[PDB]
Amino acid sequence: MLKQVEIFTDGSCLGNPGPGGYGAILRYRGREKTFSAGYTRTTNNRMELMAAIVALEALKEHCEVILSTNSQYVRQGITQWIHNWKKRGWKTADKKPVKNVDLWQRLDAALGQHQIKWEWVKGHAGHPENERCDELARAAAMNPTLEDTGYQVEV
């Protein structure tokens, strides 16, 4: 029937750095594909971001997307930072790499292909799928397998 691809994300982690994971639910066409993996050393935000990438980077065709997340970080980066950063060569005021550059760029690469619509879940009063993610992500952290090579202590 074609339609609007529905994407759901969430990321979770024990500590910081600590082991963690992410949960993604994508409804491309009529199909539900779930993504989830856990990392050894990583952070909470890295995970939150990582979630929306893997999901977005799974679409080899320009779709009309809708992305629901409770990720304070993704929300802020996307509604207030991401622009201001490029227009400045992705670096802070002290000419240092913005934190999470691997990730924010890797994401923007994806972002700028499709026509995503942002759905920000507040008081948690955001969906039953938004929670499969919480669980999806919370377990993946319970037995991490991947490497969060990209994670840099300080910078």
Side-chain angles (χ1 to χ4, degrees):
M1 160 268 165
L2 184 54
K3 207 192 143 94
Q4 295 226 330
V5 154
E6 291 172 305
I7 280 145
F8 305 98
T9 90
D10 209 325
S12 151
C13 156
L14 355 185
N16 213 251
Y22 66 83
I25 285 88
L26 164 62
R27 294 202 272 259
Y28 181 52
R29 315 261 202 138
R31 233 207 175 310
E32 251 188 30
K33 351 175 97 236
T34 300
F35 290 89
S36 146
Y39 294 70
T40 36
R41 277 255 277 176
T42 182
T43 82
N44 235 91
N45 301 163
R46 286 214 36 94
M47 285 302 103
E48 303 185 330
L49 254 192
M50 177 62 85
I53 290 156
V54 181
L56 270 163
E57 304 179 322
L59 327 148
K60 16 277 305 145
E61 107 220 3
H62 317 331
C63 332
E64 323 200 321
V65 171
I66 158 138
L67 234 164
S68 153
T69 199
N70 49 165
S71 180
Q72 192 189 165
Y73 188 69
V74 169
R75 187 204 201 275
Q76 272 199 303
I78 294 275
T79 55
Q80 291 167 352
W81 312 330
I82 214 285
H83 356 98
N84 287 335
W85 279 342
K86 350 192 57 207
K87 192 176 71 185
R88 192 249 285 281
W90 301 104
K91 272 182 204 100
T92 40
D94 60 348
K95 289 288 128 206
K96 229 193 193 263
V98 108
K99 200 210 352 157
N100 278 329
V101 72
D102 45 352
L103 286 209
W104 293 110
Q105 278 157 186
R106 170 158 188 206
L107 169 65
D108 195 58
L111 250 316
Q113 277 265 129
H114 308 93
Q115 184 185 336
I116 304 102
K117 182 171 188 170
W118 296 105
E119 204 261 318
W120 318 112
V121 172
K122 294 300 161 23
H124 233 223
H127 301 322
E129 289 109 330
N130 275 103
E131 16 195 292
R132 263 143 69 42
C133 289
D134 179 19
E135 279 180 59
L136 223 38
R138 281 181 340 198
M142 263 326 287
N143 88 291
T145 2
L146 296 175
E147 212 175 293
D148 200 2
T149 194
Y151 174 63
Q152 270 185 170
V153 259
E154 198 81 72
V155 177

